[PDB]
Amino acid sequence: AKDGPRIIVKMESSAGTGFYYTTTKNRRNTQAKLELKKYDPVAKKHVVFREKK
Amino acid sequence: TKFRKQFRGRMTGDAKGGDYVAFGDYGLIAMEPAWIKSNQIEACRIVMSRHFRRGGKIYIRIFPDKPVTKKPAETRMGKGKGAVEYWVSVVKPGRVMFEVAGVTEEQAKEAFRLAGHKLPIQTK
Amino acid sequence: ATTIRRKLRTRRKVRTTTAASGRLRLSVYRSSKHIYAQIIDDSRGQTLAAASSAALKSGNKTDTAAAVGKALAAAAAEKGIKQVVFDRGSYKYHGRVKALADAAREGGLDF
Amino acid sequence: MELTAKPRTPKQKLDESMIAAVAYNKENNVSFALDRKAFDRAFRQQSTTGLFDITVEGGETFPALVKAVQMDKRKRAPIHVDFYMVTYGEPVEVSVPVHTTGRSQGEVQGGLVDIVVHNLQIVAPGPRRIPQELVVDVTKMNIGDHITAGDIKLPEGCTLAADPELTVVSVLP
Amino acid sequence: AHKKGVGSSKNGRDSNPKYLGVKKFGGEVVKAGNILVRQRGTKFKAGQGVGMGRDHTLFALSDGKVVFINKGKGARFISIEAAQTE
Amino acid sequence: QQLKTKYNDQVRPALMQQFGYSSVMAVPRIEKIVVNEGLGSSKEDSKAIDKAAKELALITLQKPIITKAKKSISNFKLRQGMPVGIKVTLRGERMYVFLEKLINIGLPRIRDFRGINPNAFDGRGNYNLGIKEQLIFPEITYDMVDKTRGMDITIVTTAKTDEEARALLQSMGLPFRK
RNA sequence: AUGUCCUGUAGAGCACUCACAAGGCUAAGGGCACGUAAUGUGUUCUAAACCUUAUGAAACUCCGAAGGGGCACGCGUUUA
RNA sequence: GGGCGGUCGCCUCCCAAAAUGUAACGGAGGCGCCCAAAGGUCACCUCAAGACGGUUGGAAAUCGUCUGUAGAGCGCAAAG
RNA sequence: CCCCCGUGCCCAUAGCACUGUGGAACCACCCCACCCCAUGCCGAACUGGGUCGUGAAACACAGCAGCGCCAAUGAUACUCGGACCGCAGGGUCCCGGAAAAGUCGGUCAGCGCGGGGG
């Protein structure tokens, strides 16, 4: 599914002790690298989620 | 001289139609969808105007329908191509109706000319 | 705008008393004259009695709604007296929706 | 010019000389018939012009008119048309024709006989009758005159249809 | 693949309509009207939609589920004459 | 009150003095007012027009929102939330005492200003006439100012019939096409 | 036999779709014209198109069925 | 028919033969998305479009208005 | 039997226009405005309190065709079916189901349903 900074985005969250990648994307309209969030993880409540690699 | 594009299509089928009207003078109707080769009706008025007059205008009640798609003949075992034929097809509609007098239907006399089938004139 | 605006809540209201029928209806009228109530149980019904003034008469809008919310919250509620009810909420929420419903459970009704 | 007949079926309606016939007078339906000799005295000179009688087999006497014209599609064997009879309190269909007659003062610049091919007019008539008296086709065909449909020599009263502004005879040589 | 003009060589496509419950027939929560694969609840197929209509049916059992926003579902309280119990 | 009164008892009875009406409130009231202007986003691609936005509220304060026309252009301009407009609701009683700065000022200037509107009127109490690009006010610098209005004024008045549309609107104030 | 619901062909018909003929009118329209501050003055013709006159159709609209299915009431031939 | 070309998955139907209901070197529009939001809740607002004359305003973009089988639009064919 | 805030049935045999009228109990305008509510701006139809005034188009009632709107078994158009003219259409009869416009009429209904009265 293509590759080479042009179209499409390849980002995918990160949450501590709440093991889950969120596994979805959007696009680089908003800032790069940094990517603040919130939202539910495994279950329980909402957990970390702050994005990184 | 009919549509200007708006895609090809059309199919077949014969019967009669619907386009007959009580004429004011001296009518004329088709009788089923006879034979007129488009490039026949492309010689319908001019043949009805050899020299009827310098000027002169009346009324008709039809218009070229057509396309047919004939295709070459190198080996007919395929799909199609395009029209390249053309035809009108009608019912028993009016198409002439003179308004003079002594002439009566002189131009509805050699109308039957380009007419392999039967097309009376009647009157109304 | 009323006989042109008022159309938002009508059939959209009756969709809990007709989608459950476990809650009552509710008239609700402006007029700013008298107050009344006059409710009917279940969307498949529309006939019941009520009352009138002959109580405390001094016209108002705010403090006059919460009144019948208990002053007459059983006087007419014969059948069952109380049995899971829901308010109408035709228009907005000036306070007549509050001081009425917030004075509804005052005397009776389980909302 | 008599009546009788009856047949509730299209049997004697498709057998040499005859017709089909229709009637719906006040408490008088049924589908008669009658032959077809001098049965083309409609659009000739009797187009609502005058109203005789008929002497039907048994009772009454209804004058009536012609109820437009129709002849036959393509051929000339008038398949069943219609027939109005003044005895109703609301149908439509009026027969107020507009002809073409004369020497055609078209040889002024260029133009032939008054054409017209239609078979429909802006008309109306209240009750049900359709008198016979109107022209419209003539009036110095040139420019700064014209003569169509919109008011003219109009039957009796005013007109009612939808939008009074058809086309009909006109000029344009 | 690859194509051009003066020729073409493309496929075509449809799907299965499959109406299912066939009017006055028992009831339960069958299905009927795959006008929209997502579908939705219905309870009791009265036969709605724009304009006056509604399928002459009346035959209680259970829920229903049907069509799209095209015509109409039902959800009506009423068996057919029954109303008391069963 | 002030004008409202020289409107409640002055240009209110006059109508009945001429020819009455079935009501003591039959007479036309202050139906609609508004102002209307905003000649589209000229100065800058929408970012400097703000220095022509607040300029609408150059007599009072009531933060106008400019509105938008209808998005369908993509010729001239126009998008999902462009300006192109005006409006704003600011009637009231002072609105009467606002005619004090309306049915008064302006006339004393506006080029070859002599009279106000040559008939025209009719149909409604909203006769469409007004402004060019003049304020007539000095209540601020007016040097630091550098815009350019245009457009007019509408203000309806619940005056359908011509002899109301522009009837009262005659003995109404004084500055007018005499 | 009968109860009950629908599909909407065939066609009518037309008013959202494509186009159709004639008249009134339409030129916010365009140009032939001694003009010439929009040109106020004036003119001529489709043309969009409203009404009227009253056009077509597989892919048209508030119309409308044969037929068919669903089950039900009941038995005539037979395991349907 | 060899076969260069053209064909190889999904989706709109026309023609499909008013329930399902096929084909085709018969025909037309594309794609293997979007979106932290055109998602859920509550609320108010009818869209293109003409006319009234007034702004940088030689149409058109500004606004008030009646009309509006509402002819908008609702994320990109198509039907509903 | 009275006028009358109102919930359905409904969905143009209640779309608009003409006459006039009731206001005190029905209903409109209004009044006062800072505060609950805080309206793209203001508080004007969304606001808190009400005794002037009036009911004027908007609120009501019957007469009320200018066109709509319901408008028929009856002839046509359409059709499960039977032999045929006959060229596919198209067409005769037998022969059931059985559009629409046109024929009249009527249209500003009507019944239960919570009331302020002589």
Backbone angles phi, psi at C39, to 5 degrees: -110, 170
Answer yes or no: are the C-beta atoms of B111 and B48 closer than 8 Å.
Answer: yes
Locate tokens 């929420």: which residue?
Answer: C93
Answer yes or no: are the C-beta atoms of F100 and F115 closer than 8 Å.
Answer: no
Q: Which residues contact A14 (CB under 8 A, 6 or more apart)?
A: A21, A48, A49, A50, A51, A52, A53
Q: What is the DSSP secondary-structure string of chain D?
A: -------SSSGGGSSSS-------BTTB--------SS---STTS-SSSS------SSS--------S----SSSSS--------S---------------SS-TTTTTS--S--------S---SSS--------S-S-SSSS----SSSSS-SSS---SS-S---SS----
Q: Find the nucleotide nearest E57 (Cα to C1′).
A: G5
Q: What is the 3-state secondary structure (H, E, C) of A18-42?
A: CCCCCCCCCCCCCCCCCCCCCCCCC
Q: What are the tokens at B87?
A: 């035809």
Answer yes or no: are the C-beta atoms of D122 and D134 closer than 8 Å.
Answer: no
Q: If we measure between CA atoms, which residue out of D101, D125, D121 comes closest to residue D113?
A: D101
Locate tokens 């009423």: which residue?
Answer: E78
d(CA F107, CA F99): 12
Q: Which residues contact D100 (CB under 8 A, 6 or more apart)?
A: B24, B25, B99, D113, D114, D115, D116, D137, D169
Q: If we measure between CA atoms, which residue out of E77, E79, E63, E82 comes closest to residue E24?
A: E79
List chain D residues with CB under 8 Å of B99.
100, 104, 112-116
Answer yes or no: are the C-beta atoms of D8 and D67 closer than 8 Å.
Answer: no
- Chain G positions with an atom below 7 A of a protein C-beta are 3-7, 11-12, 18, 20-25, 44-46, 50-59, 62-63, 69-71
d(CA D91, CA D84): 10
Ordered alpha helix ranges (H), F7-156: 13-19
Give exposure, D112-135, as e/b (b: 16+ Cβ within 10 Å): bbbbbbbbebbbbbeebbbebebe
DSSP category for residue F7? I
d(CA E40, CA E32): 11
Give exposure, F121-136, as e/b (b: 16+ Cβ within 10 Å): beebbbbeebbeeebe
Chain D residue nearest residue B95, CA to CA = D117
| Partner-chain residue, chosen from D70, D112, D172, that has the shortest CB–CB distance to B53 | D112
The type of residue at E47 is: G
Cα angle for residues E45, E46, E49 (degrees, 5° grid): 105
CA distances from C39 to C75, C88, D9, D122 (A): 12, 10, 63, 59
Q: What are the tokens at E2?
A: 């690859």
DSSP category for residue B44? S
Report the Cα–Cα distance between both ends of chain E, in Å, rounded: 61
d(CA D12, CA B92): 25
d(CA E31, CA B22): 56
Q: What is the 3-state secondary structure (H, E, C) of E1-33?
A: CCCCCCCCCCCCCCCCCCCCCCCCCCCCCCCCC
Ordered alpha helix ranges (H), chain C: 65-71, 98-101
Answer yes or no: are the C-beta atoms of C20 and E75 closer than 8 Å.
Answer: no
Answer yes or no: are the C-beta atoms of A51 and A15 closer than 8 Å.
Answer: no
Residue nearest to nucleotide I66 (CA to C1'): D160
Residues in chain F: 178
d(CA B83, CA B100): 40
Counting beta carbons within 10 angstroms of the beta carbon of residue D25, is it exposed (0 to 12), middle (13 to 18) or buried (19 or more)? Answer: middle
d(CA F127, CA F119): 10
Residues D110, B55: C-beta atoms closer than 8 Å: yes
Answer yes or no: are the C-beta atoms of D137 and D100 closer than 8 Å.
Answer: yes
Helix or strand run (H / E) with residue F171: helix F168-171
Answer yes or no: are the C-beta atoms of F116 and F131 closer than 8 Å.
Answer: no
List chain D residues with CB under 8 Å of B124.
43, 71
Q: What are the tokens at F168?
A: 């009262």
Chain B residue nearest residue D107, CA to CA = B55
For residue C65, the SS3 value is helix
Counting beta carbons within 10 angstroms of the beta carbon of residue D68, is it exposed (0 to 12), middle (13 to 18) or buried (19 or more)? Answer: buried
Answer yes or no: are the C-beta atoms of E26 and E59 closer than 8 Å.
Answer: yes
Instruction: Give the gap in angstroms from C-alpha B51 to the nearest C-alpha of chain D.
Output: 13
D115: left (phi over 0), alpha (psi -120 to 50) or beta: alpha
Cβ under 8 Å to D: B residues 21-80: 21-25, 29-31, 53-61
CA dihedral F48, F53, F55, F59 (to 10 degrees): -160
Backbone angles phi, psi at C66, to 5 degrees: -60, -25
How distant is the alpha carbon of residue E61 from its chain centre?
Answer: 17
Cα angle for residues B109, B114, B115 (degrees, 5° grid): 85
How distant is the alpha carbon of residue A27 from its chain centre?
Answer: 11
d(CA B89, CA B66): 8
Residues D115, B97: C-beta atoms closer than 8 Å: yes
Backbone angles phi, psi at F127, to 5 degrees: -65, 105
Chains touching F (3+ CB pairs < 8 Å): none
| Partner-chain residue, chosen from D109, D111, D117, that has the shortest CB–CB distance to B24 | D117
Q: What are the tokens at C12?
A: 């959209």
CA distances from D95 to B94, B98, D43, D89 (A): 20, 22, 10, 20
The type of residue at C54 is: A
Q: If we measure between CA atoms, which residue out of E67, E69, E73, E61 comes closest to residue E32?
A: E67
Answer yes or no: are the C-beta atoms of B7 and B81 closer than 8 Å.
Answer: no
Give exposure, B57-76, as e/b (b: 16+ Cβ within 10 Å): ebbbbbebebbeeeeeeeee
Cα angle for residues B113, B119, B123 (degrees, 5° grid): 115
Distance B46 CA to G79 C1' (A): 79
Residues 105-164 of D with CB under 7 A from strand G: 117-123, 143-144, 146, 148-150, 161-164
Answer yes or no: are the C-beta atoms of C87 and C101 closer than 8 Å.
Answer: yes
Q: Which residues contact D45 (CB under 8 A, 6 or more apart)?
A: none
Largest Cα span, chain A:
38
For residue B94, the SS3 value is strand
d(CA F33, CA F156): 6
Q: What are the tokens at F157?
A: 């008045």
CA distances from D46 to C39, D66, D71, D95, D164 (A): 73, 7, 15, 12, 27
Distance D160 CA to I109 C1' (A): 29
Instruction: Give the gap in angstroms from C-alpha B12 to the nearest C-alpha of chain D.
Output: 22
F119: left (phi over 0), alpha (psi -120 to 50) or beta: left
Answer yes or no: are the C-beta atoms of B121 and B102 closer than 8 Å.
Answer: no
Report the Cα–Cα distance between both ends of chain B, in Å, rounded: 31
Q: If we measure between CA atoms, which residue out of B109, B22, D80 comes closest to residue B120?
A: B109
State the CB neighbour count (10 A cutoff) for residue B26.
19
**Nucleic strand G under 7 Å from the C-beta of E51:** yes
E82: Cα within 13 Å, side-chain hemisphere? 8
Distance C32 CA to I4 C1' (A): 17
Answer yes or no: are the C-beta atoms of C84 and C48 closer than 8 Å.
Answer: no
Chain D residue nearest residue B52, CA to CA = D112
F130: Cα within 13 Å, side-chain hemisphere? 18
The sign one gets for the Cα dihedral B22, B26, B27, B31 is positive
d(CA F143, CA D93): 78
For residue F18, the SS3 value is helix
Tell me the Cα Rg of chain D: 19
Answer yes or no: are the C-beta atoms of D131 and D48 closer than 8 Å.
Answer: yes
**Method of structure determination:** X-ray
Q: If we measure between CA atoms, which residue out of B65, B69, B86, B87 comes closest to residue B78?
A: B69
Helix or strand run (H / E) with residue F163: helix F162-165
Chain D residue nearest residue B93, CA to CA = D74
Q: Find the nucleotide nearest D170 (Cα to C1′).
A: G23
**Nucleic strand H under 7 Å from the C-beta of F36:** yes
DSSP category for residue B111? S
The type of residue at B40 is: Q
d(CA D97, CA B22): 10
Q: Find the nucleotide nearest E1 (Cα to C1′).
A: H8
CA distances from B5 to A8, B2, B67 (A): 40, 9, 11
| Partner-chain residue, chosen from B21, B60, B122, that has the shortest CB–CB distance to D118 | B21
Q: What are the tokens at D23?
A: 């009637």
CA dihedral F88, F89, F90, F93 (to 10 degrees): 160
Distance D143 CA to G44 C1' (A): 12
The type of residue at F119 is: N
Answer yes or no: are the C-beta atoms of E67 and E35 closer than 8 Å.
Answer: yes
CA distances from A35 to A41, A48, C21, D59 (A): 16, 12, 49, 99
List chain B residues with CB under 8 Å of D171.
none
Counting beta carbons within 10 angstroms of the beta carbon of residue D55, is it exposed (0 to 12), middle (13 to 18) or buried (19 or more)? Answer: exposed
Strand partners for B94: B29
State the CB neighbour count (10 A cutoff) for residue C67.
18
Q: If we measure between CA atoms, which residue out of F36, F18, F4 comes closest to residue F164?
A: F18
